[PDB]
């Protein structure tokens, strides 16, 4: 039950988890997608605004030198360096770390499944994901909704045109005024409305894909060429659980460097520490990365839904609480 | 004051002028978004359940809401009277406070009264009463 | 000259062959019904093993919350033993391990480990399984195996179990190591000095060489032999001058295990090394009941290195520290 | 001023009064054992090779060892005299420093002189020298103007100048 020495996950659960891991490796082996292993520690980190990484320090043999390192929040930068090196389609099942993150569906350290597909647009990648969710969750083909139509459907509002006033009252109808009336960031408003207005009503029977997030929420995705208002970014949800985030990767070194610079300006303006831009990723982008699409999926969450567990701690040998 | 991520069940907090009880709390942090607390609360002044969102860095004011096991005296059709066998003090509960309980409030019987800032807002009758069959 | 830093340190072909080797190992255990488990990289407690210096990090909870220090796992043993007690049966893990103050041709602050445990297997039955794995992956012949003792005679012509502290320094002076031996006062320290610079460089030349029954003093978390209580039920396997694995017949007595840790801290305090709190979760599990078993920790990078003919860890790792 | 695992080929360190030059250093740390620095050095006083183990914590004091081009001028039974072409100053090397290269020094030769604390500890003559044969008979042993005895072809006679490789001490050709 709860004696701290005991694992948070049950043996039966661990047995099935492993089986799902193998099911996942097989799926990629059948598609000729190579497996790789990138570092957990690095001299660089990510600038993404809401993430806060773990830090640790390396001290060389005999107490000679010193060197600060960051634990990877995701394997993305290293894998992009590899795509440029010419590795072809690759995937990875690694352990990632995110500080300040713990709860029913979050653990400071979790298992991530991330893969890249050269020459696959956002749609061909999404279809691959769907095939994976179908085999592991044993569910029907997911549905696909655009960020725009998801808002209109469930909130009768257009996230691409509506303005702070119009959507601040949708927040009042959702009873979120306390966190909205005082928010002057349009994007933060949208996220607030999406995560609390759309996410909980999505993917009830089968998983649901939501693409074309607003351009402001592109992260490392390309901006659409058709509609400069949306980005080539997508996420997939099931039973109210966020399963993966992916996108048609941005390959313009210039633009990618500007966004990282903006991330740092936003962080400072908020009192958050600034993180040095990973020059290796930039440098590799300058050499030229293959046109491609990638995606990161929370394995722990996939296993959780597949075994019908109620919490993430149930499918993890030892969650932080007792690690 | 308490911090969003301390909202354990049973916590009484003041919100937009009213007293609430925390039923449950959940950590939410979507892709590329900030961290939140999704809290299921008990709106005391109306006994309904509501859900609220807070930034993980938000906080709230603890509210004064305790449960005195005062004894029921009588009601004049409008107010229900209770007393403290120790304090010797009396309090009046209006029809909305005693709510759908007057049915079991038999004269002279100990009850558990929920009072917000002294005055009652909730009445909990010991549902082990022996009544008449009129 | 060197390739640009953005680039991986190992050739892509080596990365592909590493993946094939990785799949080959998983297949090997999957075929023997050994369960794969993923235990945590971060923990509230660390090890007391004297010569290990662990990485440290700080965990801050959502919003306002008291920080909590965490250590990165140097090995998954403590968690797998807790898992053993919980009744997982034979299990293995291909994890990422971390060790500070270790940089070199054969060491990386972070490296991949293959660690597995066999309930009811004795030291020898486990070594045989290690032999099957090595032959399988390296396509070499069946390993040879000698005791720590007969390994010392055959190369330094001295009986480690008896030879006093003085005879020990003579063999030290013989191979020009007196600079560290003469002022050295710890018997196991000299014994280790001799073993790794006097026996290791001469074994496993043509095929893997197991060395079992280390002095009872270098038992670590292994049982002391019932027969000869001068040796411990522990073995290490070497090949081409590379230490590949370390395993042993696991100490099941919680009372004994605790004291052993207490002794680590004292030896640490002496050496002026920081002390570490004993992992109560491991101790509590040992109290409940860990079935008799044997476990082994194999360095995958070094195994992949040998298999590929690489000359440094960096050539089989996607990104070495300087590029990480 | 230097740490074991920080040693690196070329580093000039001191070990028990004698100067050494690092050739290679390897980090070693066995199971349950402490960390070491297994390094290969050249005993600069004896042109010898040598290998030793240090604790990762152990340190070594730097050593003032540097090479330098000097031109050999002459020998006088006590010191072999060289001259700094830049500074205009001269140094004297005893027979220990000259080691076994005395028989290859010809007035005016550019030489690589290894200095330790100023004084010379070893001398390297030019890869090829041109010396006259002062005695030999109608291969066959021949005596050079330096006293060096080298094997040359039978058709080489006294008075003829030849080129020898000072590394292998062999006759290379005629001049
Ligand atoms: N270029 C490829 C896509 C990049 C995605 C980006 N790096 C990213 O992190 N997206 S994410 O949504 O923040 O994370 C992806 C998934 O990881 C899982 N995740 C994220 N944080 C946690 C935590 N803390 N615990 C468990 N699982 C987590 C969850 O399924 C997320 O959908
Ligand atoms: N419970 C039974 C197993 C105990 C194992 C014991 N705790 C242990 O760590 N033994 S070890 O020799 O120190 O490590 C095992 C192997 O890990 C590998 N290793 C250790 N440190 C490193 C480093 N730093 N880099 C790469 N590989 C390493 C190498 O093959 C070692 O033989």
UniProtKB/TrEMBL annotation, chain A:
It catalyses: D-beta-lysine + L-lysyl-[protein] + ATP = N(6)-((3R)-3,6-diaminohexanoyl)-L-lysyl-[protein] + AMP + diphosphate + H(+). GO terms for cellular component: cytosol. PROSITE patterns: AA_TRNA_LIGASE_II. Its EC number is 6.3.2.-. It comes from the Bacteria. GO terms for molecular function: acid-ammonia (or amide) ligase activity; ATP binding; lysine-tRNA ligase activity; tRNA binding. Keywords: Aminoacyl-tRNA synthetase, ATP-binding, Ligase, Nucleotide-binding. Coiled coil: none annotated. Residues 17-323 form the Aminoacyl-transfer RNA synthetases class-II family profile domain. Pfam families: tRNA-synt_2 (PF00152). Homodimer. Belongs to the class-II aminoacyl-tRNA synthetase family. EpmA subfamily. This is Elongation factor P--(R)-beta-lysine ligase. It comes from Escherichia coli.
TrEMBL record, chain B:
Signal peptide: none annotated. The keyword Nucleotidyltransferase does not apply. One of its GO terms (cellular component) is cytosol. This is Elongation factor P. The modification N6-(3,6-diaminohexanoyl)-5-hydroxylysine is found at residue 32. GO terms for molecular function: translation elongation factor activity. The chain holds residues 3 to 136 of 188 of the full protein. Residues 67-121 form the Translation elongation factor P/YeiP central domain. Belongs to the elongation factor P family. Keywords: Cytoplasm, Elongation factor, Hydroxylation, Plasmid, Protein biosynthesis. It comes from Escherichia coli. It is found in: Cytoplasm. Pathway: Protein biosynthesis; polypeptide chain elongation. Involved in peptide bond synthesis. Alleviates ribosome stalling that occurs when 3 or more consecutive Pro residues or the sequence PPG is present in a protein, possibly by augmenting the peptidyl transferase activity of the ribosome. Modification of Lys-32 is required for alleviation. Is beta-lysylated on the epsilon-amino group of Lys-32 by the combined action of EpmA and EpmB, and then hydroxylated on the C5 position of the same residue by EpmC. Lysylation is critical for the stimulatory effect of EF-P on peptide-bond formation. The lysylation moiety would extend toward the peptidyltransferase center and stabilize the terminal 3-CCA end of the tRNA. The hydroxylation of the C5 position on Lys-32 would allow additional potential stabilizing hydrogen-bond interactions with the P-tRNA. GO terms for biological process: peptide biosynthetic process.
């Amino acid at each position: 039950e709860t004696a701290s020495w005991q694992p948070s996950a049950s043996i039966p659960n661990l047995l099935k988890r492993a089986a799902i891991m193998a099911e996942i490796r097989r799926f990629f082996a059948d598609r000729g997608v190579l497996e790789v292993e990138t570092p957990c520690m690095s001299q660089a980190t990510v600038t993404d605004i809401h993430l806060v990484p773990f830090e640790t320090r390396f001290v060389g043999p005999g107490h000679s030198q010193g060197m600060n390192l960051w634990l990877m929040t995701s394997p993305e930068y290293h894998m992009k360096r590899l795509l440029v090196a010419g590795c072809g389609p690759v995937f990875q099942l690694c352990r990632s770390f995110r500080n300040e993150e713990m709860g029913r569906y979050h653990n400071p350290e979790f298992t991530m499944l991330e893969w890249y597909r050269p020459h696959y647009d956002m749609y061909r990648l999404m279809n691959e994901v769907d095939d994976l969710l179908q085999q592991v969750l044993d569910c029907p083909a997911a549905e696909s909704l655009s960020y725009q139509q998801a808002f209109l459907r469930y909130l009768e509002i257009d996230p691409l045109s509506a303005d702070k006033t119009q959507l601040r009252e949708v927040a009042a109808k959702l009873d979120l005024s306390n966190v909205a009336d005082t928010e002057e960031d349009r994007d933060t408003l949208l996220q607030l409305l999406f995560t609390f207005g759309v996410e909980p009503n999505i993917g009830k029977e089968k998983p649901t894909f939501v693409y074309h997030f607003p351009a402001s929420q592109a992260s490392l995705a390309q901006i659409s060429t058709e509609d400069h208002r949306v980005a080539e970014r997508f996420e997939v949800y099931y039973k109210g659980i966020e399963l993966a985030n992916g996108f048609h990767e941005l390959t313009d070194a210039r633009e990618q460097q500007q966004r990282f610079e903006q991330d740092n300006r936003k962080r400072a303006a908020r009192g958050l520490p600034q993180h040095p831009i990973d020059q290796n990723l930039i440098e590799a982008l300058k050499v030229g990365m293959p046109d491609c699409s990638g995606v990161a999926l929370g394995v722990d969450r996939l296993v959780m839904l597949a075994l019908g567990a109620e919490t993430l701690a149930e499918v993890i040998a030892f969650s932080v609480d007792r690690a | 004051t308490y911090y969003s991520n301390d909202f354990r069940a049973g916590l009484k907090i003041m919100l937009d002028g009213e007293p609430y009880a925390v039923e449950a709390s959940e950590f939410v942090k979507p892709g590329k978004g900030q961290a939140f607390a999704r809290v299921k609360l008990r709106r005391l002044l109306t006994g309904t359940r509501v859900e609220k969102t807070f930034k993980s860095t938000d906080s709230a004011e603890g509210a004064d809401v305790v449960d005195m096991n005062l004894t029921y005296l009588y009601n004049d059709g409008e107010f229900w009277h209770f007393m403290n066998n120790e304090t010797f003090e009396q309090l009046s509960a209006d029809a909305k406070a005693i709510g759908d309980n007057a049915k079991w409030l038999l004269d002279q019987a100990e009850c558990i009264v929920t009072l917000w800032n002294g005055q009652p807002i909730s009445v909990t009758p010991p549902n082990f009463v022996e009544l008449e069959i009129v």
